[PDB]
């Protein structure tokens, strides 16, 4: 009888508040209750079931002393009750109890251990997302509690990293001197080497745990989304706290200590990166106040990039996403002086294996957008550094073809900047332009030899391969456009130590050889347009004897390829084409 | 000269010795890694590698100089080293004999050179050892290449014995770089998949080599919070292969399955998918109540979790991929499947992938 089963579960819930019942019996009863919520929610009695259980669960949670040992049956029972509250469906039946549950959870956020606080935060997020209640004083008290945690963070950092404390052996430390869930072993009698052995796990206080600090900013973002008109001025107070938080760095001496904890440092960096994501969300609303504090922000996020652990690829990804969002705003101008460090690939990507394979496209696309927006302010040295990095990106066959095209397009745009800065500096701009042209010619050769041979091998006679063909076409088009731009830059730059510019000049023999190789390789590379892509999925080489090209893209790119040579001095054109014809 | 005469350099031993000296030298690798963009010598490492490769093509016994060529892959030079990769992945498996492949492996084992770090050994396993051994196993030369199927790990001729004892030595494991560990787990996956008989004979009452290989994988099952996900899941992929090949106890299989179910992170999606594709068919084939265990754990994770979307979508992707396996337990899963389908399809702001 489902009614009898529901009454039995109600008796179990009432027995939860009972003092006589053994703890393990309560744990088993609630474990049975947790598994059977699928059956309870079907019946219309689920509403009365909620009206009975939710007040009782809240009462038991309120009455209990805050536990901090993970193996304690009372702590496990409290955690199971909280998880049961989280698992309760969020339909309209939860609405009457929502206010009481939210108030109870908000009071526990001030007071309880990491496990229970994290569960309470999840419950708060779910309830506020689904039901969206109006603003109460508990919300302002939460925002003040978060601000207090942000202010307390340097003390936490000093306590755990800067001045670690040795836990007395065979003793159970208070939770205020552990930074994370730590397991310890205790022998009951210290008088002898042989004694009864017991093991305990200590849960930190929620006000000191960095996992809670990592989880907080998303809740603030959610409540700003729900309560935008009310808490707008309160969020403004977070900005200096956010900047101070991201500015914090653990000293080098602390990391080398005998008591240094790597997982706690990972949690600390995770909290800092979550704070930077919060900043990236609020950057466009509070842009004036962020601008006032931006000078520390540049340092803070450069240091987050330097200090992000190699193993934590997800943290590096979130940091890169937040940086991409921030760089879209005016604040990218502040990075103009420091981009010489930001071009260090170790800073940007690190030495992690997953970071190197997965996140390099994200890193170079973010940096490419930054360079493209900033390019007119970068000096000649920074332009050369960006050229060197993205030139190395052109060749790199581990990167997807989209990233190679993106780097080619970046190098194309730099050419007029490199020209302007070289004319102002009277520097070596023509040399870096020649080096870019060489990198483009070598990419043409690589496409002709490796990529086109594979594409042709994959073809079959008529009557992701599409992606490989479309990206080869796009890369060849970008290479042609970049070669034309680089040629215009070379033909528009004063040479190193030259007296004066002249409106066109016969190229040196080495440059002419490079252009001869360009003709040889690009004429092979432009064969990609022969490979058609039928609607049936067949990729086939078109009939060889056909000069009536039906495609506009091939006509345009072939005319652009000829545009490279038509702007040269007649003697250079003659030397190249006598050999190449 | 090498281009015009392919056979000339194979005899000039002193010249090639000084070419190697330059190639392994610190100043050369620093200068070419830390060039100015306008540096004239950008072709130099390609030309030097081409010469050293030409020497190595005819003199197979000089495995040391072959390994030093992988310094081309540790940097990121601005000249295309694809000809080295092509040679190492294609020509070595095709051309080298079984004895020469064994020499490659045994030189990799005893390579005690202070200047040859873990990343270079990772390059060795990635480009030389694994392709060659994969080609040999595909051709069927596994018995000759591995040598004797020594159940007792002492025999210095048994490739599996020396690999598990010397290479996987627990004392080495501490400072292990993640790339080296990953490619060692890939080599162990080759050994297990192609040559299970050499790893463990089911007739033997006990074998230490299987235990020591599982022990090498096992740190991935530890619940540490700062591990590169590819290393952890590569270890799960090795355990998935071992579980498929060998009659492993239930608790290990269930722990590996549960840990792969909790693996909803984006960073290691492909490796987790490979491991699950291997393991999910294996679970019903392994134990007498495999279908019930599949049901129990899938239901448990879908219910007790899934308040976070990525976990639920991960489990649903796994169900979709292996629906044929889940077919005999369809009736249990289908309710949660349709509920999650409705929720994911109608919750606000559905991404097209969801």
From Swiss-Prot, chain B:
It is found in: Nucleus. Changing residue 284 to L: In DEDDFA; uncertain significance. It comes from the Eukaryota. Adapter protein, which is found in various multiprotein chromatin complexes with histone acetyltransferase activity (HAT), which gives a specific tag for epigenetic transcription activation. Component of the NuA4 histone acetyltransferase complex which is responsible for acetylation of nucleosomal histones H4 and H2A. Plays a central role in MYC transcription activation, and also participates in cell transformation by MYC. Required for p53/TP53-, E2F1- and E2F4-mediated transcription activation. It is linked to Developmental delay with or without dysmorphic facies and autism: An autosomal dominant neurodevelopmental disorder apparent from infancy or early childhood. Some patients present with intellectual disability and renal, cardiac, genitourinary systems, as well as structural brain abnormalities. In some cases, the phenotype is less severe, has no systemic involvement and is characterized by autism spectrum disorder and/or intellectual disability, sometimes associated with epilepsy. Affected individuals manifest variable dysmorphic features. Interacts with MYC, E2F1 and E2F4 transcription factors. Interacts directly with p53/TP53. Interacts with GCN5L2. Component of various HAT complexes. Component of the PCAF complex, at least composed of TADA2L/ADA2, SUPT3H, TADA3L/ADA3, TAF5L/PAF65-beta, TAF6L/PAF65-alpha, TAF10/TAFII30, TAF12/TAFII20, TAF9/TAFII31 and TRRAP. Component of the TFTC-HAT complex, at least composed of TAF5L, TAF6L, TADA3L, SUPT3H/SPT3, TAF2/TAFII150, TAF4/TAFII135, TAF5/TAFII100, GCN5L2/GCN5, TAF10 and TRRAP. The PI3K/PI4K domain is required for the recruitment of HAT complexes, and the MYC-dependent transactivation. Although it is strongly related to the PI3/PI4-kinase family, it lacks the typical motifs that constitute the catalytic site of PI3/PI4-kinase proteins, and lacks such activity. This is Transformation/transcription domain-associated protein. It comes from Homo sapiens (Human). The lineage of its organism: Eukaryota, Metazoa, Chordata, Craniata, Vertebrata. The gene is TRRAP. The chain holds residues 1649 to 2002 of 3859 of the full protein.
